[PDB]
Symmetry: D3
Subunit: 136 residues, 6 copies
């Protein structure tokens, strides 16, 4: 089980501020599954407008985080979203949460990858979804 | 009905850097909406996505589709949250210069969940399509 | 041509690269370019908080970046672009999120390091702004 | 009359990233003003203009001067609009480290339009000069 | 024990310099344990440093000082001393902000990551 | 020397490069640098929304980068200590922060410095800084 840091991540993904959303890889079973982390703090650029009176992590960004972990899983050992399916959001995610990013490989069919993805906060499920991706 | 960024601002709580609807082109209240989102290289996400080559992140397209949906909800009538996204497919890369036409049609309401069919078009071709489910709180 | 050719020709980057695409190009004579205006632009938070209004000076900036594309095209980080003068600039319409700013620039004259252009920005076939622009190029 | 960024905040609506006047040093009410604008490399435009060589955009010097003109207009007396720029000349490249002295003398008022003579100086030498036409709406 | 929303009502600080995400334990008028999450998606990381992300030391002091204001204004910046930085704080760290009241407003402060001390300092207000 | 030499010597960038210009340099002994303070800086929007105030810790950071400049001038940057830092003035948009940094001692990988930030000739902040350079 491979474990690596934000420095290794930078060499693997083209994503940068303000939309690189994986801080750390905790466990990685190459080409099979990955456990990554995404710290959530009030000091991130979107919180100021989502929402002014009350900070809420945009759910589309939890999906983005997961798809970035999916990409680490692919690239480890540019990225493009092809499909999102069965996305369910089950908790408002806020400043202070750590966002465990669990993603498993499912299939590859002609340059499209299907992944199963779950984001947890404190053992509970915050969101889940099936992601489909391609590189170019 | 049709309105501008100024009415939009009075209807959505979203602000920069994640207010992603510029104009309402048509609103058939409580039924359907065609809204506009201008994509320009002068947006803060393009610097990181991706440094070599600008690409509008697919998820912000979904996000823009949801704010069109909230307008549909809120117009002719408080925070907006996602509960589900199904059958979300991305068919075209969207770039600086494109106008993102945001077509949203209300489908059902059930115990706080609003469901919509959403289609984002650029030049009359489908860039993304998804089914959206959202709720409203506090 | 598109935002990618544009990126290979101009040194300007965020938050001041204000041309998205080139619609028409009569090489060394004139250019019609496009700048999409959206509320998701960093200057709108400050200009103004109550009511988004595209700042007139940035329309001018967009017109001058177009002029520079006219200059650098059919002809990377270290050749820079500078306003030397602006004459006869008139702002006729307020430009807003939603508007597509059509950037029309025609080359008029070059001498001893200065390019003069006649520039007109339009929104929906109506004149938003017009100016005479004088610019130079260094290192 | 000498006042600071705090009085300034009460008189002008402009805010970050386009409030470009830091301090007023001299005000002859409704006739002339000397304001101040600190140029530092920690300003959001410098990263794009230009990467690897900071250059204050000339149009933001024009903007700074116009805000000094707005102050001249609003003090000892609600949005602000550019109507015109004429005879704009840029004589020095302005950089991080330079203090910009914003000199604005009122010149005429005809049917809604204020006109001003404007000069921006760095270290006693002229960085930019221009004639500015402005108007106040809603 | 209280959250970001509560914090927002007690500190005037806002983005990009509000650096307390959550208060884990407060013993009023006496001590506070506070949390500040560190992620690569914070605005300073892009120039500190370009090759290599590294949380500015002075920002850990800022976070501890905010942790200390919370101690002060709940149930209701003049000097730093003996500040030492022992560990580089990085994206992914959960920065635990410990602040005890030591006299009066002086404080002893220790920012811990993963139970190791990241930095420590005396603070006055 | 100017912001352009400064860029060639510090690795720091926006939004945390906080020296605009070096005014005097006694190589390996001392430095007088400049930091322009303007409302158009990213931190002011949050510190504080009502009322701009430059944060005390960013003055320290400015002084520390002046020390980096001093260390690197005629020959990554890490803070190791800060001592006897007092803040004696509220610095505002419009102020020029004069960054006075004297080098004192290098023992065992630690550079030590006395640092003073002045506004309008009067003292704004003063501190002893300990730093070290890695990689």
């Amino acid at each position: 089980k491979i474990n690596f840091d934000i420095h290794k991540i930078l060499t693997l993904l083209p994503h940068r501020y303000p939309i690189l959303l994986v801080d750390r890889v905790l466990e990685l079973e190459p080409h099979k599954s990955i456990k990554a982390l995404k710290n959530v703090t009030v000091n991130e650029p979107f919180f100021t407008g989502h929402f002014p009176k009350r900070p809420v992590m945009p759910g589309v960004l939890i999906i983005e985080a997961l798809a970035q972990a999916a990409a680490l899983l692919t690239f480890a050992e540019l990225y493009y979203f092809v499909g999102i399916d069965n996305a369910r959001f089950k908790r408002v995610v806020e400043p202070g949460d750590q966002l465990i990013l669990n993603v498993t490989f499912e299939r590859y069919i002609r340059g499209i990858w299907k992944f199963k993805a779950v984001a947890e906060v404190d053992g509970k499920v915050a969101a889940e979804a099936e992601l489909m991706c391609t590189v170019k």
